[PDB]
Structure formats: structure tokens, C-alpha cells
């Protein structure tokens, strides 16, 4: 017997300076079989948070359903307190670490705004390790798009023209139209050399005014 | 009345009674005393020897030792005394196991107390008719320390105490002869402050006393009956008057 | 490795005319080594004797628990234990642990103080009561001793005549066994007295 397998997906999500986003595939596969064409993966979990579970599907949903339910007990008890992200950094450390010996084969990420208006996204193991990043991707196609970000987002591995060795080019806090134009190039830069991804694009733009979400289409 | 049976229920004043009735049972039991200076802490207890057949090498000694660096006394009734010690010293010894640093004394007394405040919670259990005195230093510190427990489940720190019978004589005797801001500073003086604290109530016997002291370096000692008769008699000279 | 094939010990029992004889070996150690010249594998409770083989923990641990009991059955019934109950006790006191058991070849020996009779028996590790009358053995070297004891024991024997046929049955076997034989010991028993002899053999 095998209790868990695979379903695919490949996600990524970024913080700007006064915003953030989160991106996720929109296909479900069993064993090179299109199990479906459009099934979402990313959810506004109240108190303007977005998260995603890329990997096994059931565990990737039951985890969420405990988080949509923890969030409200945080409001009923503590009188409608808005739940920061630092809380969910190690709350989710516990929901998962409650299963260390029969765990959740899921790679969870979160997107939100901190107290100072900045954005941040956290990454996770399937067994509850909470870390922070600003450029992150996960799933099966995760070792294939991060190195496009460090050479664009963080400008890594490229000095500036004129010195050949001394001076690094400067940095800037990327804007939204950079990111969406970038991530919309990412999957189109993957789905042609990869099979599991394709068939949709769900960006979850977060801002102070609230939440948006855009959709686009790819090669079936 | 009706409110003076159990533990669960209160007066229409607030008083809970049975606990107050245990402390009446303390006072049907022999004295005890505890004094501290700076390089020493002491303890006393008026025993009896009122029977001749009874062998005297295992004399009923209120004192008990919890570890090397701790001692104890009690009052009240002794059928319960053997219990608290037998759980106390267990706990000190299941501490350094779990922590390899022996007890801060304030950790101990919150476990002799703790076993009393569980036996005053639920009916179907009786309190302890007992009231203790602790004396011992910490490891790697000089500050001399002393508490007392009490079946209400409380405890306080004391520079000098006397409990058991006729304590209401010995306290005020110690309210003059002491002074918190100039303690005795020698292991003789606490004893002399301590012996003549017994001599008010003890029919000028000298076979009817036990003293046991404590110091750093895991030190404890019981004293000799002949080492008391010269700590006794020399006082009597000093009231030749 | 088997538990039974680790330390090494051999015991013997044999009936005789108003006398019996029991003996054991003294070697003990790990696999392919020996540590002690001196481990009395044989014991006694009341007049009734007992001998154990196999794993040493379950030697030392069976001594105590049986000693925990017969010092009650004496206090409780005001009478010593006799064998033919004892031989049943060791069955049910082992058959409770049919799973996670002990690893022993026991024996037993004694006289029944009412009818002046002799008695012995043997067992296995879950309590099959063998009631041979001529002799019974146990240890690592059983197969090396059911042969060189059968041909040597007649019926209706006399104590010292019965003595020297234990030892030679005990010596010529243990000298061939691979995991035994640093000094021996023997008991000859009569209705009302007992004596202990040791024996001489090799060394390391």
C-alpha cells in the first residue's frame, strides 16, 4: 500500500517593497494523464493572506482547511484581531509538526504584508520549517526558474558594464508590471521544455486596498 | 453551626475552617526553633525522655535531612512527618538527575507546600497536621536561608521562628534578643541565642534538648549532650543574679 | 545466535538405591571465551534441589523468583516444599510466559520425605514435564551425553558406585564439548544427609 503519491503543480510568489504576489499552476495530473484543466490552488485565507500547497493534493487542501479554521478562532477569542504573518510563521510550524511521523507531503508558501507595510513570503518543508525569502518557487519545476530570478530580481552573477570585476550593478525594488511581465514569461519559459505544468496562470496580487487576481492561458 | 466539617465549603464570612482546625493540632506538639546569623543556621527541638524502658540511642529526633545541604524539622503529629520527607528527598534527588544542579531551597519548599495544598482541595482526603522548618544553603552561595510550610499551603521567609507548644512565649523572647540588621556572626552565638530560647519552657532540663546546625560545603552536624551541658550551665552562671 | 548456545553449562541427574546424584559445570563466558572458573550453576531449596542451564540471566533470575516463593510456602503452610509439586510449579511458572520466554534447560532432584523415595525430572522452556527415572540431562552437550550415560547406568545403584559413573559420564563428555569444562561439582544425596565434592579436570 502507498498512502500518498503526486499531483504536480509548480508555484512561486514574491514580495516587492509595498506589495507582494503569489503564482501557481492550474493543472492536475496523475501519471501523464490530464486529470483536469482548471482547478485552483491559491486562496485568500482572510486577513489579506494568500497561501498555496504544491505537491500532493489532499494534504495540500486539508492543511488549508485547518488554517481557514484556525484564523477564525483567532478572531473569536482575541476580539477580531488582525492576524499578522509572523504568527502564521510558526503556527504552521505546529499544524505540520503535529504530523512528524505520518506527514504532509506538501510545500507550503504564504504571502502577506507585515506590520510596516512591506511584503514577505515564507517557505516551508513538509515537516514544519519556517523561513523567509523574497524570491521563491516550489513544486516539481522549482529547480528550473529560480536561476532566472537571481539574474533578474537580485541581479546576481552579473557585474556592471565598465570595470570587468570591480563594481556590481545596483538594485531596485521591482514594480508590479515587472513581476507579472516576468512570471508571465517564466511558465512560458518552462511549459515548452516541461510537461507537468501548463493550462493557466493564477496570480494573486496583494495590496493595502486588498486582493486582486489575474488569469491568463498557456499551451494545453 | 454546620460550616465546620468539610473543606469544600465556606462560611458566610469567607473563612474556611478545617485548615484553621489543623493548626490547633500543631500546638498539641513539642516546640521547635530556627535561627540564622551569617555563617551559620541552627535548629532546636525540645524532646522528651519521660520513659526508662525505651532505648535512647534512637531517640525521637524531630530533625530529618533531605540532602547534604538541607535539614528539616516539624511539629504536629509524626505519622504524617515520615511522609513529607519521604516525598521531599525523593524530589530533591529527582531534580539533580533531571538537571544536575541541586535545589534552590525555594524549589524544595514549594514541593513540601505543594503536597499540602493538594490535600486541602478535595473532600475524601485529610490535611496534614504538621508545620515544618527548612534550613539549608544553596550550592555555591553563602546566603543563609529559612522558610516554614503550613497546611494552608503557604510559606514565608523568616529570620527567626519558633513553632510548637508555648511558641507564643518564645517569639517575643526573640523579638528583643535579635536584630535583623546585626545578626549573630559566629556559630556559638546563634546557639546561645537558641538555647536560652528553650530555657523559658523546659523545666531547666538539659537531657531534653537537641541542636543541629548547618554550614556550607554540604556541612551538617548534630551536637553532643556534653557539649550542651557547658552551653547550658555557663548561662546559669550568667543568671547567678 | 540462539540464546541457548552462548554461555555453556551441562547438568546431570540420576536415580539410585535410596540415593540420587546431581552435578554441574562451572565454566561461564561470552561466545568463544571464558571468564569464570566458578559459577555454581546448581542450587538448592529446602531439601529439594535444582539445576539450570542456558542463559545466565535466566539462571540467576530463576533462582531468586523460586526463592521468593518457597520461603512463603513454608511460612504459609508450615511445611517445606516437596518435589512433585515443585516440578509442577516450574511448568506453570514458565508457561505463563509462552511468548517472550526464558531460555533454559532445567532439572530437579530430591527425595519425598514421606515415602523415603527418590525423584528427579527435566523440562523444556515452556514446561513439558519429562519424568524419566534412570536419568535426565540438559545443556549444550545433551547429544554428547545421552549416549555416554545410557551405556553406563544400570538400575539399582549404590551411592559411591553411583558417584563415579556420574563424574566419568560428566568428564568424558564435557571434555569433548566446545563451550564448557573448567572444573565441576557434584552432590550425592540420601534421606538425611548431603555432601559436596568437586572434581579435577583441565584449565585455561
Amino acid at each position: 500500500f502507498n498512502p500518498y503519491g503526486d499531483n504536480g503543480g509548480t508555484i512561486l510568489g514574491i514580495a516587492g517593497e509595498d506589495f507582494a504576489v503569489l503564482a501557481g499552476d492550474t493543472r492536475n495530473i496523475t501519471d501523464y494523464s490530464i486529470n483536469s484543466r482548471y482547478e485552483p490552488k491559491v486562496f485568500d485565507c482572510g486577513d489579506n493572506i494568500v497561501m498555496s500547497a504544491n505537491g500532493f493534493a489532499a494534504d495540500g487542501d486539508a492543511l488549508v482547511k485547518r488554517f481557514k479554521n484556525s484564523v477564525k478562532w483567532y478572531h473569536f477569542d482575541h476580539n477580531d484581531k488582525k492576524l499578522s504573518i509572523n504568527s502564521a510563521a510558526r503556527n504552521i510550524q505546529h499544524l505540520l509538526y503535529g504530523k512528524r511521523f505520518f506527514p504532509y507531503y506538501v510545500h507550503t508558501i504564504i504571502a502577506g504584508l507585515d506590520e510596516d507595510g512591506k511584503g514577505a513570503v515564507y517557505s516551508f518543508d513538509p515537516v514544519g520549517s519556517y523561513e523567509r525569502e523574497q524570491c521563491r518557487a516550489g513544486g516539481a519545476a522549482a529547480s528550473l526558474i529560480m536561476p532566472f530570478l537571481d539574474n533578474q530580481v537580485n541581479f546576481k552573477n552579473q557585474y556592471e558594464p565598465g570595470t570587468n570585476g570591480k563594481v556590481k550593478k545596483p538594485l531596485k525594488y521591482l514594480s508590479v508590471e515587472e513581476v507579472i511581465k516576468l512570471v508571465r514569461d517564466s511558465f512560458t519559459s518552462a511549459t515548452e521544455r516541461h510537461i507537468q505544468v501548463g493550462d493557466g496562470l493564477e496570480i494573486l496580487i496583494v495590496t493595502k486596498d486588498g486582493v486582486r487576481k489575474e488569469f491568463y492561458e498557456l499551451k494545453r | 453551626s454546620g460550616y465546620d466539617r468539610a473543606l469544600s465549603i465556606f462560611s458566610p464570612d469567607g473563612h474556611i475552617f478545617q485548615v484553621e482546625y489543623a493548626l490547633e493540632a500543631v500546638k498539641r506538639g513539642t516546640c521547635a526553633v530556627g535561627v540564622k546569623g551569617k555563617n551559620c543556621v541552627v535548629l532546636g527541638c525540645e524532646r522528651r525522655s519521660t520513659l526508662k524502658l525505651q532505648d535512647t540511642r534512637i531517640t525521637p529526633s524531630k530533625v530529618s535531612k533531605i540532602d547534604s545541604h538541607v535539614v528539616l524539622s516539624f511539629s504536629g503529629l509524626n505519622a504524617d512527618s515520615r511522609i513529607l520527607i519521604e516525598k521531599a528527598r525523593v524530589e530533591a534527588q529527582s531534580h539533580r538527575l533531571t538537571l544536575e544542579d541541586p535545589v534552590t531551597v525555594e524549589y524544595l519548599t514549594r514541593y513540601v507546600a505543594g503536597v499540602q495544598q493538594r490535600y486541602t482541595q478535595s473532600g475524601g482526603v485529610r490535611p496534614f497536621g504538621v508545620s515544618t522548618l527548612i534550613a539549608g544553603f544553596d550550592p555555591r552561595d553563602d546566603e543563609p536561608k529559612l522558610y516554614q510550610t503550613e497546611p494552608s499551603g503557604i510559606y514565608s521567609s523568616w529570620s527567626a521562628q519558633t513553632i510548637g507548644r508555648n511558641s507564643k512565649t518564645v517569639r517575643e523572647f526573640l523579638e528583643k534578643n535579635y536584630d535583623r540588621k546585626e545578626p549573630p556572626a559566629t556559630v556559638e552565638e546563634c546557639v546561645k541565642l537558641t538555647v536560652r530560647s528553650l530555657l523559658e519552657v523546659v523545666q531547666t532540663g538539659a537531657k531534653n534538648i537537641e541542636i543541629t546546625v548547618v554550614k556550607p560545603d554540604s556541612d551538617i552536624v548534630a551536637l553532643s549532650s556534653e557539649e550542651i551541658n557547658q552551653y547550658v550551665t555557663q548561662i546559669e552562671q550568667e543568671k547567678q543574679e | 545466535s540462539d540464546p541457548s548456545s552462548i554461555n555453556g553449562g551441562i547438568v546431570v541427574a540420576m536415580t539410585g538405591k535410596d540415593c540420587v546424584a546431581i552435578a554441574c559445570d562451572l565454566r561461564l563466558g561470552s561466545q568463544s571465551l571464558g571468564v569464570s572458573n566458578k559459577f555454581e550453576k546448581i542450587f538448592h531449596y529446602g531439601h529439594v534441589f535444582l539445576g539450570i542451564t542456558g542463559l545466565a540471566t535466566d539462571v540467576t533470575t530463576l533462582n531468586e523468583m523460586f526463592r521468593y516463593k518457597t520461603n512463603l510456602y513454608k511460612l504459609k503452610e508450615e511445611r517445606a516444599i516437596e518435589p512433585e509439586t515443585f516440578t509442577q510449579l516450574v511448568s506453570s511458572s514458565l508457561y505463563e510466559r509462552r511468548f517472550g520466554p526464558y531460555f533454559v534447560g532445567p532439572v530437579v532432584a530430591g527425595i519425598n520425605s514421606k515415602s523415603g523415595k527418590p525423584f528427579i525430572a527435566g523440562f523444556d522452556l515452556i514446561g513439558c514435564i519429562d519424568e524419566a527415572k534412570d536419568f535426565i540431562v540438559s545443556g549444550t552437550a545433551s547429544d554428547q551425553l545421552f549416549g555416554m550415560c545410557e551405556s553406563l547406568y544400570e538400575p539399582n545403584l549404590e551411592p559411591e558406585d553411583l558417584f563415579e559413573t556420574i563424574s566419568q559420564a560428566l568428564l568424558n563428555a564435557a571434555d569433548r564439548d566446545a563451550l564448557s569444562g573448567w572444573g565441576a561439582v557434584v552432590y550425592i544425596i540420601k534421606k538425611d544427609e548431603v555432601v559436596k565434592r568437586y572434581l579435577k579436570m583441565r584449565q585455561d
Binding site: - | 535531612k65 533531605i66 528527598r89 538527575l97 | 569464570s36 559459577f39 540471566t57 540467576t60 517472550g100
Partner: protein
């Protein structure tokens, strides 16, 4: 590997040890004190799988100090050695056992005769004049019954041991970074300084 050994003599008792810890490939530390002072005139020393070694000793000594505290008349080794195994005889058949093997040396007073005991991770208890564990005693169940008789003095030990060690570190392919030694007698434990 993690060797250990000890010797009985006429008027006192000796025990030895090692000083080495190795976890994986790297030899971490060179001063591991692999004993625990149960009582003043008694001492034990243990070898086995990491973790199972240590907190066996602290467990029982906490029980032995608990018997010395209330009777105020310490108990002979033969009540200890009979007691210690009583943990192990039931520890092996339990769920997680304690794969440790130990020595116990001391000095009973009322007789004024010392003792020695050798116990394994199963329960095999027996007194010897000399003993060890691991793959050590293979090298030393041969000397200590040739260059050993029971009418010695205390200095014979280290002098009969300072070569016995050499037999091991001359053959034993594993470093063990030396040894501490300590001795038992009426005036109590005594640690040696140099070798």
C-alpha cells in the same frame, strides 16, 4: 574502541577506563570521565551505545544516594550489584533497552575485604579479580593470570597496568587517547594524576 577494565588486589581495588569518544569519523574529545561516584567507598564505570551509557548511571545513583540518605548506613556492593542488574534483567526484555555493560568496585567495611563485580547488558553478574569488556579482554585474560597473584600492594596495579595498556595500544588499531585510573580503600576514592 571504548575499553574498560579493573583489577582486585589484597588491600584495595583499582579500576581503569578510556578517554576517547568517536562519533562517525571524528574523535571529538579526549577527557571523558566514564564513571560515577555512587557512594564514597563504591564506584562504577560503564560502556555502551551513546546516550544509553550516561543516564543509566545518573538514574541509579540517584536511587543509591536515596538509600544512603535515610538509613545513614551505606549498603555493600553485593546489594548494589544484585540491584543494578535487576534493572537490566528487565531492561533487555522491555521496549527500548539499555545496551550498556559495567564494572563495579568498592570496599565493604564490616569485613574489611574488598569486592568486584562484572555485569553486561543482559544481567550476567559475577565477581572476578580482573575483568574488562569489549574486544579488550581478549588481550588481557592471559597476563593477569600469569603476572598476577592475590597478595599484592596498591602500587602493583598501575605498575602491572602501565604495561597492560601497552599491550593494547601496541595492537588495538583504534586510538583511545589514554586512561584515567582511580583506587578504592578505607580513606575513599583517589584519582591518580599522570598515567
Amino acid at each position: 574502541m571504548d575499553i574498560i577494565l579493573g583489577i582486585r588486589v589484597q588491600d584495595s581495588v583499582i579500576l581503569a577506563s578510556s578517554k576517547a569518544v568517536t562519533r562517525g569519523i571524528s574523535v571529538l574529545k579526549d577527557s571523558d570521565d566514564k564513571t560515577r561516584q555512587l557512594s564514597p567507598h563504591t564506584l562504577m564505570s560503564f560502556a555502551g551505545e551513546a546516550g544509553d551509557t550516561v543516564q543509566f548511571a545518573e538514574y541509579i545513583q540517584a536511587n543509591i544516594q536515596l538509600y544512603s540518605i535515610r538509613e545513614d548506613y551505606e549498603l555493600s556492593p553485593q546489594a548494589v550489584s544484585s540491584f543494578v542488574r535487576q534493572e537490566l534483567a528487565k531492561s533487555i526484555r522491555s521496549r527500548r533497552p539499555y545496551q550498556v555493560n559495567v564494572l563495579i568496585g568498592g570496599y565493604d567495611k564490616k569485613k574489611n575485604k574488598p569486592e568486584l563485580y562484572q555485569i553486561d547488558y543482559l544481567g550476567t553478574k559475577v565477581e572476578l579479580p580482573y575483568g574488562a569488556h569489549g574486544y579488550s579482554g581478549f588481550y588481557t585474560f592471559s597476563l593477569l593470570d600469569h603476572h598476577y597473584r592475590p597478595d599484592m600492594t596498591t602500587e602493583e596495579g598501575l605498575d602491572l597496568l602501565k604495561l597492560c595498556v601497552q599491550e593494547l595500544e601496541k595492537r588495538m588499531p583504534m586510538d583511545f587517547k589514554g586512561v584515567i585510573v582511580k583506587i578504592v580503600d578505607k580513606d575513599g576514592i583517589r584519582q591518580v594524576d599522570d598515567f
